[PDB]
């Protein structure tokens, strides 16, 4: 008869105390377009260097500590797809043939 539902979230019942809490610091993060955001981190906690800001772009920390900048590689190019299937001698053959064709079309 009756059908019940439940969101997947536990509901507690306590007292919203305002006086005695765990203390906490504040750090400022800086994005690319001059945006600043302040994030309250806990005391007994490591402060991470980069942090995804409220703005949506990745924002570094406002104090210079120099983390790892890129540590990445470019994924794949059409030049890589060409180079992994043919040789540079074949490429130079097509290049010289195209150069002679543009020569005979331009001034020849």
């Amino acid at each position: 008869r009756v059908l019940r539902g439940s969101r997947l979230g536990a509901v507690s019942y306590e007292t919203d105390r305002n006086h005695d809490l765990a203390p906490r610091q504040i750090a400022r993060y800086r994005t690319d377009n001059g945006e600043e955001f302040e994030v309250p981190f806990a005391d007994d906690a490591e402060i991470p260097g980069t942090w995804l800001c409220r703005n949506g772009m990745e924002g570094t920390l406002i104090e210079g500590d120099l983390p790892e900048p890129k540590k990445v590689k470019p994924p794949r190019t059409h030049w890589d797809m060409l180079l992994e299937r043919r040789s540079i001698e074949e490429l130079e053959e097509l290049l010289k043939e195209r150069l002679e064709l543009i020569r005979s079309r331009r001034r020849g």
């Binding site: 060409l82 043919r86 130079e92 097509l94 290049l95 195209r98």
Partner: peptide, 12 residues
């Protein structure tokens, strides 16, 4: 041919 030649030209 034109595509691969243009890619080799821009690689040059």
């Amino acid at each position: 041919k034109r595509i691969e030649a243009g890619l080799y030209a821009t690689q040059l």
